């Protein structure tokens, strides 16, 4: 129940011993305890933790990468933040500030003039040079010279002015102190402001400290990785890298992550930032930043699904990898790199393999255990693309990935250029129902197609969430039939079909499905949640069966979320949410290649050629829906709907968002932490 903290210096160990002590005084002898293992350096601390001779240490982003690498394999368990918990600042963004209308993007930096905070610094050197690495001229070692030739001239504080002069061209001597006006963050920004340099590599907040007036700021832009610019305040959605400020790592297996959280959580409680002048956790008389930076305000537990690569982030890991390794592709230069497609099942891997061979290298396969694991892989580069359903296009989007092509199902001869939007989920009731309105449903009787389903649950049950704020849905409706709820719940008390299949999510449950929930409306409930076509299909006699043969379309009305009502006829203006088609998602940096490669593939192996017999077919499956949905006609180009927020639709996103409040998703809670 004790946590062995690692200190990299006598001072730090003294502070640690104080920590240990003041944590004994009032903290049940059943509550966490601190032991102090003293090591000579960070690497020795990282090693101690992996060799199970210590348990935790706090490191800068760079050592968080090192700690993650074999054979240590350590992960981020607790984070240090710098604001209020309303605006807990745990990250910071390495951004590239430039002057408005100077016309050039990240990939057009050769020749330009650079301003770096200081050589060896994070945001100001390691990250930018890292990414830029493959664009530097060989020999790339020594690095300093190679950067000197890349740029036309720059101000690289602390660089070797003597040997590679052009690096102090904007600041002769390269002074490594405030003496040199272009040193440090502000020094680098000023280098840009004074117009000595074209681009200045600094922190996101750097410009917000050198220009108090939005007016002047509006004259500066930030270079983004997809070779486009954006307003300095849109840094979160345009930066070279996202860096964790200060992180606490542990072992990946074992590691006592939970115990560690229980320690520091309480610690920050008894000695938080004001909590006491007896013992200050984020400061010391013996020094500064001992154990934890002094600027700290508190701690935050890191979602368990997270690994260093996820925590550090794609861009960051990319930058550091290059520096650490140095490995470029003197391969073509423009010819698209093969698309690695992630498979979910054995049968998926098998179909993907058949596909890979037939594509002749343009398609490759990667196998992950679950949809979320595939998403983590597309996230960190181990994989590039895969098709997802609404719920996952949402999750994937929270994680930074983006929808690129949507799966099309209907109107077949115009396909390739017209993204389908979906099938409107509508709430239904009988016109002969008393004033029933959207915001009136409480205590009513419900009819659902089945729990978990989109049109009959997630969407409706998802919007209704803002009218409760708790996940106990069975106790909102007086009663109802929701195939799948617990056999006893109120959601099961209106379901017919007896025996073992009472309230079961299969057709043996009469009230199951679209048609089934309608019958459930007609025979026991006042509200049914289906889709826009469900009624026209089950009226006008279009349905033989007893209970339906005489039902008439006009005897019903679908509820509109603004309280009013409208005719089943114009569902288009009175639905709950749209409900999308499956979409291929991929990383922003691979978006281009995915379009080119897939269009050419759906060409060669699409629904076009029907001789699936003696050749390959992208849309047919040995099993069922492998890789794509079998009823897929083509992959549409999501022209401008290329972001989950623009492809899903506010209503849908609102709902799905609300539901993930009830059903966790470790991957989502992790991506949320890094950004949302």
């Amino acid at each position: 129940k004790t946590v062995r903290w690692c200190a990299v210096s006598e001072h730090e160990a003294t502070k640690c011993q104080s920590f240990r002590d003041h944590m004994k005084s009032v903290i049940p002898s059943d509550g966490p305890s601190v032991a102090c293992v003293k090591k000579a350096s960070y690497l020795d601390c990282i090693r101690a933790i992996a060799a199970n001779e210590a348990d935790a240490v706090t490191l800068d982003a760079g050592l968080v990468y090192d700690a993650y690498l074999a054979p240590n394999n350590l992960k981020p368990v607790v984070a240090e933040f710098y604001g209020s918990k309303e605006d807990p600042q745990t990250f910071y963004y390495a951004v590239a500030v430039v002057k408005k209308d100077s016309g050039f993007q990240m990939n057009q930096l050769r020749g330009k003039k650079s301003c770096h905070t200081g050589l060896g610094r994070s945001a100001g050197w390691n990250i930018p040079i890292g990414l830029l690495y493959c664009d530097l001229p060989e020999p790339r070692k020594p690095l300093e010279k190679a950067v000197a030739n890349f740029f036309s001239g720059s101000c690289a504080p602390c660089a070797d002015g003597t040997d590679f002069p052009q690096l102090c061209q904007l600041c002769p001597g390269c002074g490594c102190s405030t003496l040199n006006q272009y040193f440090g963050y502000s020094g680098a920004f000023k280098c840009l402001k004074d117009g000595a340099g074209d681009v200045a590599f600094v922190k996101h907040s750097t410009i917000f400290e050198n220009l108090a007036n939005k007016a002047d700021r509006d004259q500066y832009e930030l270079l983004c990785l997809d070779n486009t610019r954006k307003p300095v305040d849109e840094y979160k959605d345009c930066h070279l890298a996202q860096v964790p400020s200060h992180t606490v790592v542990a072992r990946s297996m074992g590691g006592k992550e939970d115990l560690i959280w229980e320690l520091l959580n309480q610690a920050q409680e008894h000695f938080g930032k004001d909590k006491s002048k007896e013992f200050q956790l984020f400061s010391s008389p013996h020094g500064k930043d001992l154990l934890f930076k002094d600027s700290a305000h508190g701690f935050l537990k890191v979602p368990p699904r997270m690994d260093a690569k996820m925590y550090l982030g794609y861009e960051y890991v990319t930058a550091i990898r290059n520096l650490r390794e140095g490995t470029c592709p003197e391969a073509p230069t423009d010819e698209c790199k093969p698309v690695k497609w992630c498979a979910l099942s054995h049968h998926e891997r098998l179909k993907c393999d058949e596909w890979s061979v037939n594509s002749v290298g343009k398609i490759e396969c990667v196998s992950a255990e679950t949809t979320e694991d595939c998403i983590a892989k597309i996230m960190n580069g181990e994989a590039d693309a895969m098709s997802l359903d609404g719920g996952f296009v949402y999750i994937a989007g929270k994680c930074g990935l983006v929808p690129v092509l949507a799966e099309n199902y209907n109107k077949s001869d115009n396909c390739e250029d017209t993204p389908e939007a979906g099938y409107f989920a509508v709430a239904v009731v009988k016109k002969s129902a008393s004033d029933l309105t959207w915001d009136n449903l409480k205590g009513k009787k419900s009819c659902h197609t089945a729990v978990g389903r989109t049109a009959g649950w997630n969407i409706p049950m998802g919007l209704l969430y803002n009218k409760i704020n708790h996940c106990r849905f069975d106790e909102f409706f007086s009663e109802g039939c929701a195939p799948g709820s617990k056999k006893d719940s109120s959601l099961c008390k209106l379901c017919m079909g007896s025996g073992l299949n009472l309230c079961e999510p299969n057709n043996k449950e009469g009230y199951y499905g679209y048609t089934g929930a309608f019958r459930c409306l007609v025979e026991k409930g006042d509200v049914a949640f289906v889709k826009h076509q469900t009624v026209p299909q089950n009226t006008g006699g279009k349905n033989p069966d007893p209970w339906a043969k005489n039902l008439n379309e006009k005897d019903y009305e679908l509820l509109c979320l603004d309280g009013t009502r409208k005719p089943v006829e114009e569902y288009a203006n009175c639905h709950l949410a749209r409900a999308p088609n499956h979409a291929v998602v991929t990383r922003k940096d691979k978006e281009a290649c995915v379009h080119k490669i897939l269009r050419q593939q759906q060409h060669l192996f699409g629904s076009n050629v029907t001789d699936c017999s003696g050749n390959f077919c992208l849309f047919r499956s040995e099993t069922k829906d492998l890789l794509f949905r079998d009823d897929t006609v083509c992959l549409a180009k999501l022209h401008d709907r290329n972001t989950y927020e623009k492809y899903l639709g506010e209503e849908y996103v609102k709902a799905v968002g609300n539901l993930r409040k009830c059903s966790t998703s470790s991957l989502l809670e992790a991506c949320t932490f890094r950004r949302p």
Side-chain angles (χ1 to χ4, degrees), residues 375-402:
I375 300 188
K377 274 172 175 293
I378 296 175
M379 260 162 63
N380 67 22
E382 308 186 305
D384 313 316
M386 85 174 134
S387 187
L388 271 23
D389 64 47
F392 282 129
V393 153
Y394 171 75
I395 293 184
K398 296 295 287 185
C399 301
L401 303 190
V402 301

PDB file of all heavy atoms in Angstrom, residues 375-402:
ATOM      1  N   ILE A 375      -8.760   1.913 -34.039  1.00  0.00           N
ATOM      2  CA  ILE A 375      -8.734   3.362 -33.992  1.00  0.00           C
ATOM      3  C   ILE A 375      -7.456   3.888 -33.348  1.00  0.00           C
ATOM      4  O   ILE A 375      -6.920   4.903 -33.773  1.00  0.00           O
ATOM      5  CB  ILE A 375      -9.943   3.933 -33.246  1.00  0.00           C
ATOM      6  CG1 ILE A 375     -11.237   3.499 -33.945  1.00  0.00           C
ATOM      7  CG2 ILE A 375      -9.854   5.455 -33.237  1.00  0.00           C
ATOM      8  CD1 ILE A 375     -12.495   4.150 -33.407  1.00  0.00           C
ATOM      9  N   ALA A 376      -6.962   3.197 -32.328  1.00  0.00           N
ATOM     10  CA  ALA A 376      -5.737   3.624 -31.678  1.00  0.00           C
ATOM     11  C   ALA A 376      -4.608   3.460 -32.687  1.00  0.00           C
ATOM     12  O   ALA A 376      -3.701   4.293 -32.757  1.00  0.00           O
ATOM     13  CB  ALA A 376      -5.463   2.778 -30.421  1.00  0.00           C
ATOM     14  N   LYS A 377      -4.667   2.391 -33.478  1.00  0.00           N
ATOM     15  CA  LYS A 377      -3.638   2.147 -34.478  1.00  0.00           C
ATOM     16  C   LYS A 377      -3.670   3.165 -35.597  1.00  0.00           C
ATOM     17  O   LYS A 377      -2.615   3.625 -36.021  1.00  0.00           O
ATOM     18  CB  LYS A 377      -3.752   0.735 -35.055  1.00  0.00           C
ATOM     19  CG  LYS A 377      -3.025  -0.323 -34.236  1.00  0.00           C
ATOM     20  CD  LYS A 377      -3.332  -1.711 -34.741  1.00  0.00           C
ATOM     21  CE  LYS A 377      -2.515  -2.756 -34.006  1.00  0.00           C
ATOM     22  NZ  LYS A 377      -1.047  -2.648 -34.308  1.00  0.00           N
ATOM     23  N   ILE A 378      -4.855   3.531 -36.085  1.00  0.00           N
ATOM     24  CA  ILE A 378      -4.915   4.527 -37.158  1.00  0.00           C
ATOM     25  C   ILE A 378      -4.393   5.809 -36.540  1.00  0.00           C
ATOM     26  O   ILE A 378      -3.726   6.607 -37.184  1.00  0.00           O
ATOM     27  CB  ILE A 378      -6.351   4.758 -37.679  1.00  0.00           C
ATOM     28  CG1 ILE A 378      -6.892   3.479 -38.309  1.00  0.00           C
ATOM     29  CG2 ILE A 378      -6.364   5.891 -38.705  1.00  0.00           C
ATOM     30  CD1 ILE A 378      -8.339   3.573 -38.739  1.00  0.00           C
ATOM     31  N   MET A 379      -4.693   5.987 -35.264  1.00  0.00           N
ATOM     32  CA  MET A 379      -4.234   7.152 -34.530  1.00  0.00           C
ATOM     33  C   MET A 379      -2.689   7.272 -34.483  1.00  0.00           C
ATOM     34  O   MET A 379      -2.136   8.321 -34.845  1.00  0.00           O
ATOM     35  CB  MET A 379      -4.782   7.102 -33.099  1.00  0.00           C
ATOM     36  CG  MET A 379      -5.985   7.969 -32.842  1.00  0.00           C
ATOM     37  SD  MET A 379      -6.852   7.462 -31.347  1.00  0.00           S
ATOM     38  CE  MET A 379      -5.644   7.752 -30.081  1.00  0.00           C
ATOM     39  N   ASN A 380      -2.007   6.209 -34.041  1.00  0.00           N
ATOM     40  CA  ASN A 380      -0.556   6.239 -33.905  1.00  0.00           C
ATOM     41  C   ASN A 380       0.279   5.794 -35.104  1.00  0.00           C
ATOM     42  O   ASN A 380       1.505   5.651 -34.993  1.00  0.00           O
ATOM     43  CB  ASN A 380      -0.120   5.444 -32.670  1.00  0.00           C
ATOM     44  CG  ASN A 380      -0.385   3.951 -32.799  1.00  0.00           C
ATOM     45  OD1 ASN A 380      -0.513   3.426 -33.901  1.00  0.00           O
ATOM     46  ND2 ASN A 380      -0.441   3.258 -31.660  1.00  0.00           N
ATOM     47  N   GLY A 381      -0.370   5.569 -36.241  1.00  0.00           N
ATOM     48  CA  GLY A 381       0.367   5.179 -37.431  1.00  0.00           C
ATOM     49  C   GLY A 381       0.522   3.702 -37.747  1.00  0.00           C
ATOM     50  O   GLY A 381       0.917   3.357 -38.861  1.00  0.00           O
ATOM     51  N   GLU A 382       0.217   2.824 -36.797  1.00  0.00           N
ATOM     52  CA  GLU A 382       0.343   1.386 -37.039  1.00  0.00           C
ATOM     53  C   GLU A 382      -0.685   0.944 -38.080  1.00  0.00           C
ATOM     54  O   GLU A 382      -0.595  -0.151 -38.619  1.00  0.00           O
ATOM     55  CB  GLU A 382       0.168   0.596 -35.729  1.00  0.00           C
ATOM     56  CG  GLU A 382       1.082   1.087 -34.584  1.00  0.00           C
ATOM     57  CD  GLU A 382       1.024   0.216 -33.318  1.00  0.00           C
ATOM     58  OE1 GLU A 382      -0.087  -0.007 -32.763  1.00  0.00           O
ATOM     59  OE2 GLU A 382       2.101  -0.245 -32.863  1.00  0.00           O
ATOM     60  N   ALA A 383      -1.642   1.819 -38.369  1.00  0.00           N
ATOM     61  CA  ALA A 383      -2.702   1.548 -39.336  1.00  0.00           C
ATOM     62  C   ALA A 383      -3.191   2.864 -39.985  1.00  0.00           C
ATOM     63  O   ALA A 383      -3.053   3.941 -39.397  1.00  0.00           O
ATOM     64  CB  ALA A 383      -3.858   0.840 -38.629  1.00  0.00           C
ATOM     65  N   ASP A 384      -3.769   2.786 -41.182  1.00  0.00           N
ATOM     66  CA  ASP A 384      -4.238   4.006 -41.834  1.00  0.00           C
ATOM     67  C   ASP A 384      -5.746   4.164 -41.998  1.00  0.00           C
ATOM     68  O   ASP A 384      -6.280   5.253 -41.800  1.00  0.00           O
ATOM     69  CB  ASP A 384      -3.604   4.174 -43.220  1.00  0.00           C
ATOM     70  CG  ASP A 384      -2.106   3.937 -43.219  1.00  0.00           C
ATOM     71  OD1 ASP A 384      -1.406   4.443 -42.303  1.00  0.00           O
ATOM     72  OD2 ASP A 384      -1.623   3.247 -44.152  1.00  0.00           O
ATOM     73  N   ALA A 385      -6.451   3.103 -42.367  1.00  0.00           N
ATOM     74  CA  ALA A 385      -7.884   3.268 -42.582  1.00  0.00           C
ATOM     75  C   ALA A 385      -8.760   2.092 -42.236  1.00  0.00           C
ATOM     76  O   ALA A 385      -8.293   0.967 -42.104  1.00  0.00           O
ATOM     77  CB  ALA A 385      -8.145   3.670 -44.039  1.00  0.00           C
ATOM     78  N   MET A 386     -10.047   2.378 -42.096  1.00  0.00           N
ATOM     79  CA  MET A 386     -11.038   1.362 -41.795  1.00  0.00           C
ATOM     80  C   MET A 386     -12.408   2.031 -41.815  1.00  0.00           C
ATOM     81  O   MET A 386     -12.510   3.233 -41.581  1.00  0.00           O
ATOM     82  CB  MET A 386     -10.776   0.751 -40.420  1.00  0.00           C
ATOM     83  CG  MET A 386     -11.376   1.529 -39.268  1.00  0.00           C
ATOM     84  SD  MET A 386     -11.199   0.682 -37.684  1.00  0.00           S
ATOM     85  CE  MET A 386     -10.659   2.029 -36.702  1.00  0.00           C
ATOM     86  N   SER A 387     -13.453   1.264 -42.109  1.00  0.00           N
ATOM     87  CA  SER A 387     -14.806   1.808 -42.120  1.00  0.00           C
ATOM     88  C   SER A 387     -15.461   1.655 -40.750  1.00  0.00           C
ATOM     89  O   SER A 387     -15.333   0.614 -40.102  1.00  0.00           O
ATOM     90  CB  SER A 387     -15.663   1.108 -43.162  1.00  0.00           C
ATOM     91  OG  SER A 387     -16.919   1.765 -43.249  1.00  0.00           O
ATOM     92  N   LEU A 388     -16.185   2.691 -40.337  1.00  0.00           N
ATOM     93  CA  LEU A 388     -16.843   2.740 -39.036  1.00  0.00           C
ATOM     94  C   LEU A 388     -18.313   3.146 -39.106  1.00  0.00           C
ATOM     95  O   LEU A 388     -18.780   3.710 -40.092  1.00  0.00           O
ATOM     96  CB  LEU A 388     -16.115   3.756 -38.147  1.00  0.00           C
ATOM     97  CG  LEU A 388     -14.932   3.396 -37.238  1.00  0.00           C
ATOM     98  CD1 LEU A 388     -14.225   2.139 -37.720  1.00  0.00           C
ATOM     99  CD2 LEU A 388     -13.997   4.593 -37.180  1.00  0.00           C
ATOM    100  N   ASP A 389     -19.052   2.861 -38.046  1.00  0.00           N
ATOM    101  CA  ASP A 389     -20.439   3.275 -38.023  1.00  0.00           C
ATOM    102  C   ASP A 389     -20.511   4.566 -37.195  1.00  0.00           C
ATOM    103  O   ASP A 389     -19.550   4.922 -36.496  1.00  0.00           O
ATOM    104  CB  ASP A 389     -21.349   2.176 -37.454  1.00  0.00           C
ATOM    105  CG  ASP A 389     -21.056   1.847 -36.007  1.00  0.00           C
ATOM    106  OD1 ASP A 389     -20.928   2.779 -35.185  1.00  0.00           O
ATOM    107  OD2 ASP A 389     -20.981   0.642 -35.681  1.00  0.00           O
ATOM    108  N   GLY A 390     -21.640   5.261 -37.302  1.00  0.00           N
ATOM    109  CA  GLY A 390     -21.840   6.516 -36.608  1.00  0.00           C
ATOM    110  C   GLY A 390     -21.193   6.657 -35.246  1.00  0.00           C
ATOM    111  O   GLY A 390     -20.463   7.614 -34.994  1.00  0.00           O
ATOM    112  N   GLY A 391     -21.463   5.708 -34.363  1.00  0.00           N
ATOM    113  CA  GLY A 391     -20.912   5.776 -33.026  1.00  0.00           C
ATOM    114  C   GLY A 391     -19.402   5.842 -33.005  1.00  0.00           C
ATOM    115  O   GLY A 391     -18.805   6.515 -32.152  1.00  0.00           O
ATOM    116  N   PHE A 392     -18.771   5.137 -33.939  1.00  0.00           N
ATOM    117  CA  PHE A 392     -17.320   5.139 -33.987  1.00  0.00           C
ATOM    118  C   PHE A 392     -16.759   6.304 -34.800  1.00  0.00           C
ATOM    119  O   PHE A 392     -15.636   6.742 -34.554  1.00  0.00           O
ATOM    120  CB  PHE A 392     -16.801   3.774 -34.456  1.00  0.00           C
ATOM    121  CG  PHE A 392     -16.830   2.725 -33.365  1.00  0.00           C
ATOM    122  CD1 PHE A 392     -17.423   1.481 -33.573  1.00  0.00           C
ATOM    123  CD2 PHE A 392     -16.299   3.008 -32.104  1.00  0.00           C
ATOM    124  CE1 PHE A 392     -17.490   0.545 -32.539  1.00  0.00           C
ATOM    125  CE2 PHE A 392     -16.359   2.086 -31.071  1.00  0.00           C
ATOM    126  CZ  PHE A 392     -16.957   0.853 -31.289  1.00  0.00           C
ATOM    127  N   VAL A 393     -17.533   6.832 -35.743  1.00  0.00           N
ATOM    128  CA  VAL A 393     -17.058   7.984 -36.481  1.00  0.00           C
ATOM    129  C   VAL A 393     -17.019   9.097 -35.455  1.00  0.00           C
ATOM    130  O   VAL A 393     -16.214  10.017 -35.532  1.00  0.00           O
ATOM    131  CB  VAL A 393     -18.004   8.351 -37.597  1.00  0.00           C
ATOM    132  CG1 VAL A 393     -17.906   9.821 -37.902  1.00  0.00           C
ATOM    133  CG2 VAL A 393     -17.669   7.523 -38.824  1.00  0.00           C
ATOM    134  N   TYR A 394     -17.899   9.008 -34.473  1.00  0.00           N
ATOM    135  CA  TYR A 394     -17.907  10.001 -33.418  1.00  0.00           C
ATOM    136  C   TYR A 394     -16.638   9.768 -32.594  1.00  0.00           C
ATOM    137  O   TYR A 394     -15.762  10.626 -32.563  1.00  0.00           O
ATOM    138  CB  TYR A 394     -19.148   9.858 -32.534  1.00  0.00           C
ATOM    139  CG  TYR A 394     -19.119  10.729 -31.294  1.00  0.00           C
ATOM    140  CD1 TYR A 394     -19.350  12.109 -31.364  1.00  0.00           C
ATOM    141  CD2 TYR A 394     -18.824  10.176 -30.051  1.00  0.00           C
ATOM    142  CE1 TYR A 394     -19.284  12.911 -30.219  1.00  0.00           C
ATOM    143  CE2 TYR A 394     -18.753  10.958 -28.910  1.00  0.00           C
ATOM    144  CZ  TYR A 394     -18.984  12.322 -28.995  1.00  0.00           C
ATOM    145  OH  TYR A 394     -18.916  13.071 -27.838  1.00  0.00           O
ATOM    146  N   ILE A 395     -16.522   8.608 -31.950  1.00  0.00           N
ATOM    147  CA  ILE A 395     -15.332   8.334 -31.143  1.00  0.00           C
ATOM    148  C   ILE A 395     -14.037   8.639 -31.894  1.00  0.00           C
ATOM    149  O   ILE A 395     -13.157   9.332 -31.365  1.00  0.00           O
ATOM    150  CB  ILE A 395     -15.255   6.853 -30.662  1.00  0.00           C
ATOM    151  CG1 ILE A 395     -16.379   6.544 -29.669  1.00  0.00           C
ATOM    152  CG2 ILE A 395     -13.934   6.606 -29.951  1.00  0.00           C
ATOM    153  CD1 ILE A 395     -16.312   5.153 -29.094  1.00  0.00           C
ATOM    154  N   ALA A 396     -13.913   8.126 -33.115  1.00  0.00           N
ATOM    155  CA  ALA A 396     -12.709   8.360 -33.902  1.00  0.00           C
ATOM    156  C   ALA A 396     -12.456   9.863 -34.072  1.00  0.00           C
ATOM    157  O   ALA A 396     -11.312  10.321 -34.048  1.00  0.00           O
ATOM    158  CB  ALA A 396     -12.825   7.685 -35.262  1.00  0.00           C
ATOM    159  N   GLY A 397     -13.536  10.624 -34.231  1.00  0.00           N
ATOM    160  CA  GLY A 397     -13.417  12.059 -34.410  1.00  0.00           C
ATOM    161  C   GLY A 397     -12.931  12.770 -33.171  1.00  0.00           C
ATOM    162  O   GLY A 397     -12.202  13.750 -33.259  1.00  0.00           O
ATOM    163  N   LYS A 398     -13.336  12.284 -32.006  1.00  0.00           N
ATOM    164  CA  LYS A 398     -12.909  12.898 -30.757  1.00  0.00           C
ATOM    165  C   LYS A 398     -11.428  12.656 -30.642  1.00  0.00           C
ATOM    166  O   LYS A 398     -10.726  13.403 -29.978  1.00  0.00           O
ATOM    167  CB  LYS A 398     -13.615  12.264 -29.556  1.00  0.00           C
ATOM    168  CG  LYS A 398     -15.122  12.467 -29.535  1.00  0.00           C
ATOM    169  CD  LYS A 398     -15.519  13.945 -29.384  1.00  0.00           C
ATOM    170  CE  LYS A 398     -15.255  14.464 -27.968  1.00  0.00           C
ATOM    171  NZ  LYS A 398     -15.742  15.862 -27.758  1.00  0.00           N
ATOM    172  N   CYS A 399     -10.964  11.603 -31.303  1.00  0.00           N
ATOM    173  CA  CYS A 399      -9.555  11.236 -31.277  1.00  0.00           C
ATOM    174  C   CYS A 399      -8.740  11.885 -32.382  1.00  0.00           C
ATOM    175  O   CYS A 399      -7.571  11.536 -32.585  1.00  0.00           O
ATOM    176  CB  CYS A 399      -9.405   9.728 -31.379  1.00  0.00           C
ATOM    177  SG  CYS A 399     -10.234   8.850 -30.034  1.00  0.00           S
ATOM    178  N   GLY A 400      -9.351  12.811 -33.111  1.00  0.00           N
ATOM    179  CA  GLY A 400      -8.614  13.487 -34.154  1.00  0.00           C
ATOM    180  C   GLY A 400      -8.659  12.891 -35.543  1.00  0.00           C
ATOM    181  O   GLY A 400      -8.181  13.531 -36.482  1.00  0.00           O
ATOM    182  N   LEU A 401      -9.214  11.693 -35.711  1.00  0.00           N
ATOM    183  CA  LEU A 401      -9.275  11.111 -37.049  1.00  0.00           C
ATOM    184  C   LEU A 401     -10.406  11.776 -37.795  1.00  0.00           C
ATOM    185  O   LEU A 401     -11.208  12.499 -37.203  1.00  0.00           O
ATOM    186  CB  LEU A 401      -9.512   9.608 -36.992  1.00  0.00           C
ATOM    187  CG  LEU A 401      -8.511   8.751 -36.209  1.00  0.00           C
ATOM    188  CD1 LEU A 401      -8.789   7.281 -36.493  1.00  0.00           C
ATOM    189  CD2 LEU A 401      -7.091   9.095 -36.604  1.00  0.00           C
ATOM    190  N   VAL A 402     -10.489  11.538 -39.093  1.00  0.00           N
ATOM    191  CA  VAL A 402     -11.550  12.167 -39.860  1.00  0.00           C
ATOM    192  C   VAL A 402     -12.202  11.328 -40.948  1.00  0.00           C
ATOM    193  O   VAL A 402     -11.549  10.527 -41.617  1.00  0.00           O
ATOM    194  CB  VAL A 402     -11.045  13.448 -40.545  1.00  0.00           C
ATOM    195  CG1 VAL A 402     -10.523  14.418 -39.512  1.00  0.00           C
ATOM    196  CG2 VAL A 402      -9.967  13.093 -41.568  1.00  0.00           C
TER     197      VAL A 402
END
